[PDB]
Amino acid sequence: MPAVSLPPKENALFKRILRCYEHKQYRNGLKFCKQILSNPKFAEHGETLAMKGLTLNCLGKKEEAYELVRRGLRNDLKSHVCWHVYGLLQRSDKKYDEAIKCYRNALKWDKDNLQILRDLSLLQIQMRDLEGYRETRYQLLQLRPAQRASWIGYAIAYHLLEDYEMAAKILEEFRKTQQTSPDKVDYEYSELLLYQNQVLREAGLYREALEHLCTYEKQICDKLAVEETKGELLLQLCRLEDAADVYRGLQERNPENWAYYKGLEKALKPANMLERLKIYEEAWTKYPRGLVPRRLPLNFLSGEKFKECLDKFLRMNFSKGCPPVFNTLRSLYKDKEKVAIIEELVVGYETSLKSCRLFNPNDDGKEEPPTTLLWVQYYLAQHYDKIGQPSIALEYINTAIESTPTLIELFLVKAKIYKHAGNIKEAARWMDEAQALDTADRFINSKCAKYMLKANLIKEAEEMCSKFTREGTSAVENLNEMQCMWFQTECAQAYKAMNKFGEALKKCHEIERHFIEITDDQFDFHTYCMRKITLRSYVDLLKLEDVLRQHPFYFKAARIAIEIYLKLHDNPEELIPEKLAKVETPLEEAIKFLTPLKNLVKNKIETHLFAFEIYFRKEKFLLMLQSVKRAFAIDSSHPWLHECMIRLFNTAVCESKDLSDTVRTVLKQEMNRLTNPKNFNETFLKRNSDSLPHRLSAAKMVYYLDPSSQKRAIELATTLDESLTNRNLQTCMEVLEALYDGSLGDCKEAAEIYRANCHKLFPYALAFMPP
Amino acid sequence: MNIRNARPEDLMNMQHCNLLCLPENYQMKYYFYHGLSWPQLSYIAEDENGKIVGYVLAKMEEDPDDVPHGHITSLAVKRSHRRLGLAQKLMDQASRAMIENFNAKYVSLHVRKSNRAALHLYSNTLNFQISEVEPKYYADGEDAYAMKRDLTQMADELRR
Numbered sequence: 050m051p052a053v054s055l056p057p058k059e060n061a062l063f064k065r066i067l068r069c070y071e072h073k074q075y076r077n078g079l080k081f082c083k084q085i086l087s088n089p090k091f092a093e094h095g096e097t098l099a100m101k102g103l104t105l106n107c108l109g110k111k112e113e114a115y116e117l118v119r120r121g122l123r124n125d126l127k128s129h130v131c132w133h134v135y136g137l138l139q140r141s142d143k144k145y146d147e148a149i150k151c152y153r154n155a156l157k158w159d160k161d162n163l164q165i166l167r168d169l170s171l172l173q174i175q176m177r178d179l180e181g182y183r184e185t186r187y188q189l190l191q192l193r194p195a196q197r198a199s200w201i202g203y204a205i206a207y208h209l210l211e212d213y214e215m216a217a218k219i220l221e222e223f224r225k226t227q228q229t230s231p232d233k234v235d236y237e238y239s240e241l242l243l244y245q246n247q248v249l250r251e252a253g254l255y256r257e258a259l260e261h262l263c264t265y266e267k268q269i270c271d272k273l274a275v276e277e278t279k280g281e282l283l284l285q286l287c288r289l290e291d292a293a294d295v296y297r298g299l300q301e302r303n304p305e306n307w308a309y310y311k312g313l314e315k316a317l318k319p320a321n322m323l324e325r326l327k328i329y330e331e332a333w334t335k336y337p338r339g340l341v342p343r344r345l346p347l348n349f350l351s352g353e354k355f356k357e358c359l360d361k362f363l364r365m366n367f368s369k370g371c372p373p374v375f376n377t378l379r380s381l382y383k384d385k386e387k388v389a390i391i392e393e394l395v396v397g398y399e400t401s402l403k404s405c406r407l408f409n410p411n412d413d414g415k416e417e418p419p420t421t422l423l424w425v426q427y428y429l430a431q432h433y434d435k436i437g438q439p440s441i442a443l444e445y446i447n448t449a450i451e452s453t454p455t456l457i458e459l460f461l462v463k464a465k466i467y468k469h470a471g472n473i474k475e476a477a478r479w480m481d482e483a484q485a486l487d488t489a490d491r492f493i494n495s496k497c498a499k500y501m502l503k504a505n506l507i508k509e510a511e512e513m514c515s516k517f518t519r520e521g522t523s524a525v526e527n528l529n530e531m532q533c534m535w536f537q538t539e540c541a542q543a544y545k546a547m548n549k550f551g552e553a554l555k556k557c558h559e560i561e562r563h564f565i566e567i568t569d570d571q572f573d574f575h576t577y578c579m580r581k582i583t584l585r586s587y588v589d590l591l592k593l594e595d596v597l598r599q600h601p602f603y604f605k606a607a608r609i610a611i612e613i614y615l616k617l618h619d620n621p622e623e624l625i626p627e628k629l630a631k632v633e634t635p636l637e638e639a640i641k642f643l644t645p646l647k648n649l650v651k652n653k654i655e656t657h658l659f660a661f662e663i664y665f666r667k668e669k670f671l672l673m674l675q676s677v678k679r680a681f682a683i684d685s686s687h688p689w690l691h692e693c694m695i696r697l698f699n700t701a702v703c704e705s706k707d708l709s710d711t712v713r714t715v716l717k718q719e720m721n722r723l724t725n726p727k728n729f730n731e732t733f734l735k736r737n738s739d740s741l742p743h744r745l746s747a748a749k750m751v752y753y754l755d756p757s758s759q760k761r762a763i764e765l766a767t768t769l770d771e772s773l774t775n776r777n778l779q780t781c782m783e784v785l786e787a788l789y790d791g792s793l794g795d796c797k798e799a800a801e802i803y804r805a806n807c808h809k810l811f812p813y814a815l816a817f818m819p820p
Numbered sequence: 821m822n823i824r825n826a827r828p829e830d831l832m833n834m835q836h837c838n839l840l841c842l843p844e845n846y847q848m849k850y851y852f853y854h855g856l857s858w859p860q861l862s863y864i865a866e867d868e869n870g871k872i873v874g875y876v877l878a879k880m881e882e883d884p885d886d887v888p889h890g891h892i893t894s895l896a897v898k899r900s901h902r903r904l905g906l907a908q909k910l911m912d913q914a915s916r917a918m919i920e921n922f923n924a925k926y927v928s929l930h931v932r933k934s935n936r937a938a939l940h941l942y943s944n945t946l947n948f949q950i951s952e953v954e955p956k957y958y959a960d961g962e963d964a965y966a967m968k969r970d971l972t973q974m975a976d977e978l979r980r
């Protein structure tokens with residue numbers, strides 16, 4: 050209000066305009082604006098014009114807001130009010146960086162302004178201007194040293210900069226003033242302490258943290274956090290005796306938390322496989338209801354102790370009749386030997402149960418009811434599905450459906466069978482069945498909708514989801530209202546499977562809009578968490594948001610979009626499918642989708658192979674080399690990565706150098722380090738001849754080099770002897786698509802001797818059935 | 821299945837589980853609201869691969885009419901992992917946390933009166949008791965029962 054210097058009547062008016070804005074008396078504030086602006090002497094008066102525009106913006110009249118705030122500002126560019134309003138206005142449009150400039154300019158003319166300092170800092174942390182947030186939080190603490198928020202923010206400033214020790218000293222200072230105060234909430238103090246402890250730990254001051262935790266432990270009420278970080282620290286300090294006590298208490302508190310079993314193994318250090326099993330034995334007899342202690346030894350036991358435990362585990366689970374027994378053991382199925390122990394044992398259980406309703410003929414216990422046999426048949430149905438024997442699995446599920454036609458789980462597994470066997474259209478009808486058996490269960494509804502989606506019955510999936518969708522609007526619009534990315538990702542794949550690239554891109558883009566929205570959702574907790582002192586979770590959320598697009602949903606969407614934008618480059622508010630497929634620069638839009646992957650998903654080989662495809666079409670040979678290398682670091686023998694090097698090696702040798710002879714020779718020195726392309730391919734096929742996914746990548750590549758040995762390409766690609774390490778349904782679909790593909794030149798001849806040769810191998814798979 | 825305290829990087833996965841399992845859905849911001857207000861209170865159940873098969877999203881009631889008490893915003897267990905006791909185990913963990921962190925004297929939740937499944941779960945297995953009906957609670961228009969589980973015996977077993 051000092052920035053404004055007006056006659057009393059208007060100075061009074063002006064104060065009312067500010068007050069109307071704070072109390073959202075917009076219609077009344079507007080009247081006062083017009084009163085000042087109607088007097089000719091102040092029709093140009095900048096702060097009233099700025100305050101006019103900001104009020105208008107609250108009523109959704111953005112462009113008149115921008116005319117007014119801009120015009121008002123220009124009349125008085127040394128008014129902190131005008132600069133502050135322009136920042137305020139640009140903030141409501143999430144243009145946070147530009148808002149920062151206006152606040153900094155406003156403080157050029159009002160250095161110690163409390164509101165602008167708070168607003169400015171609030172955006173600096175939002176944008177991760179960590180240096181500037183510390184300046185701003187420091188400036189605040191000097192002006193308002195007795196306000197808790199002044200210290201909280203200063204400490205947070207240094208923590209996020211990783212100046213752990215300064216963060217430590219600010220926090221201890223604040224903690225002293227909070228021990229004395231009577232206004233202190235136990236919970237808020239407790240949270241302050243665990244945050245103070247966490248920074249000490251993140252600074253690797255492990256013993257200081259432990260002494261702190263023991264000093265203030267009785268004033269910390271989150272006793273889970275007390276004991277969990279006590280165990281962490283005691284292990285870190287080699288207090289293994291005391292660590293074991295801590296983790297024994299933890300396991301009593303929650304016997305179904307894996308972490309405390311690994312803490313005990315770290316504390317006790319069992320020397321042999323049986324000393325380690327003692328840890329879990331003791332947990333059983335102490336927590337007989339618990340299932341985690343009886344499951345985890347199956348991961349490390351072997352030999353006859355493995356089958357004894359498995360025998361106890363399956364008998365328990367088959368008598369209690371719980372469904373997810375097979376699900377719990379799927380990780381054991383990576384061990385080819387354990388699977389035989391399972392198969393011989395469960396198969397034995399069935400043959401024994403029919404001759405005499407006992408798990409083994411020599412068992413003493415009372416006879417098992419008929420349900421016990423259904424559960425082993427339900428297991429073996431899932432077991433033979435995983436083994437890759439569809440028909441053998443499909444007979445078990447059908448015997449069991451005939452015995453108890455009421456148990457919905459058998460219809461899901463029957464659907465899973467037909468899916469795994471490459472017949473999703475069949476799988477879909479079994480979900481429809483299962484779904485109609487419990488109209489009330491959305492979990493079944495979703496799986497039906499999902500299977501219908503994958504079967505490209507998109508409109509049928511909408512109507513199925515609609516059974517749980519809000520009755521106001523249509524189902525797709527409510528799923529997007531509720532940030533349902535499983536439906537939208539699965540929908541984008543379906544739309545992409547039917548060459549409806551426009552509609553798929555619409556779904557891919559709606560998923561990004563969700564991640565934008567979630568990224569913005571942090572804004573309100575910046576201040577909230579300073580009054581709540583939930584600082585651990587606050588910094589956890591800040592760290593979460595910094596890598597938010599690491600989530601599987603983003604990658605699933607981004608993959609689909611990048612595939613479509615490449616296929617649209619090879620052959621060419623409101624998201625309209627038609628307009629989105631029309632994009633004049635498809636590779637540029639793909640780049641926008643790839644950028645978060647390049648930063649946050651360097652784990653995956655795909656993020657570099659995709660990047661390669663964008664830069665390969667985009668001519669950029671420097672970026673093309675960057676992508677092949679990071680992929681080579683992850684898996685040197687990857688079949689897609691192989692196809693990518695053979696395409697880079699030769700477009701360097703063959704044509705369009707158009708760069709410094711160093712850029713033209715750097716690839717010659719770098720690729721001859723990582724001789725000749727054709728023998729480079731032959732050696733790949735040499736080392737990886739047994740593998741087929743590799744074998745095809747060689748096969749297409751030898752056709753890339755010449756069309757003459759196409760016939761040999763066709764024979765190396767269509768090998769189907771069981772010698773092959775990875776000859777499965779989806780790879781064979783890859784090979785036969787590769788003949789229609791054109792990547793093997795017009796092989797309609799071998800394509801149908803291949804479709805029919807594959808129909809005999811996967812008789813349920815649809816991709817291989819006669820016309 | 822692993823049962824552990826939910827953390828902010830778990831909430832999207834919780835939201836996915838919710839959307840698969842239940843009709844009452846929330847936006848991510850509401851999930852953040854819980855994890856940044858009552859972090860100790862929500863628990864998850866995950867499998868070998870860190871995939872969520874159950875959760876309990878919980879809070880303290882913000883303006884309790886009487887004593888402080890916790891409130892179940894949402895609880896789901898995928899039917900595929902039915903019959904392993906996760907709903908009880910999840911519920912027992914949030915209960916213990918509400919006691920330690922907020923001195924809750926009970927836990928309350930809401931249920932459509934026609935939701936037989938949930939009524940039988942909460943009343944028969946979790947010792948929840950009907951206390952009061954909220955007329956036309958749901959946007960559907962159905963009345964809700966409010967159910968309370970007394971937390972003072974648990975609290976006494978903990979102090980021992």
Ligand SMILES: O=P(O)(O)OC1[C@H](OP(=O)(O)O)[C@@H](OP(=O)(O)O)[C@@H](OP(=O)(O)O)[C@@H](OP(=O)(O)O)[C@@H]1OP(=O)(O)O
Binds near residue numbers: 499
């Ligand atoms: O790879 P994912 O993205 O994790 O998804 C799924 C899916 O996950 P969600 O249900 O969690 O969304 C399934 O079921 P769940 O057991 O987790 O409930 C499942 O297949 P179904 O829907 O057919 O049960 C499946 O299958 P698999 O056992 O073959 O790994 C796996 O599916 P995808 O093969 O489609 O990736």
